[PDB]
Amino acid sequence: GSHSMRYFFTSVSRPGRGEPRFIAVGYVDDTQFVRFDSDAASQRMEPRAPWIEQEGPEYWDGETRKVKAHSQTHRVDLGTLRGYYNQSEAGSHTVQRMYGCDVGSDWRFLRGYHQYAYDGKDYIALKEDLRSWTAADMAAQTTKHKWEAAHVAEQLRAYLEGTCVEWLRRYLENGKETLQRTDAPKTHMTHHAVSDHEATLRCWALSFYPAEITLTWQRDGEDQTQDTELVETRPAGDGTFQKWVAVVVPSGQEQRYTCHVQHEGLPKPLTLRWEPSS
């Protein structure tokens, strides 16, 4: 199927003392594989998946140099942004950056992206053409003119379409045992009486990968959203994900209701009904 490589960076200023708290994480699809935390002892980029431990010392040295350089850029930016917005030196502020690349089933470049936020709001982002910039406000418009003059988008486009895709294909091969395996949802239904004449039916999807999934309820073959609850997809903690969807029904009428599960790991969607003897 399709794949992605994405890096996420967060810097939080600490004006009372010291440098910003900085956390970087790298993902292939929904699998975290590297991390950096300015508060951790190593002061190195660290592995978080078995297939990245295959990389030698030159890889770790290179990634550590790049991530520390990113942390210093964020430290400088927090100062510049405090000035652009006429903010006090006393408050804590945040910068967030995400970039990466998507490939299709043929492992060829599909799209690239590079987004930046200040205090949780869009600041500046590269457009899908990988040439242009979207500036949210006049401070970001100043940054946009600066980056047009410095050929920034050209350098980013070269990385996103080239280097990024080359690293992603390498990781997909080295980590094939897990990265190229889809784990279909393990499904079951539970029943929870809410009175002597109504009950909640809860349709569970467990231990699935990747995280993308759709759970829908139908009543007599048509979509049902009234009296339903759908929780956000959540990590199990072992690399897989979970989700559930529930509906309140009149007791005795459970067979009218079906839960429908769609996931990349299921050739055809699954349909579940409550087993009334349970």
Binding site: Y59, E63, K66, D77, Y123, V152, Q155, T163
Partner: peptide
């Protein structure tokens, strides 16, 4: 692998 591009706002 990460990008080496340094662009300050």
């Amino acid at each position: 692998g990460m990008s080496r591009i340094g662009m300050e706002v």
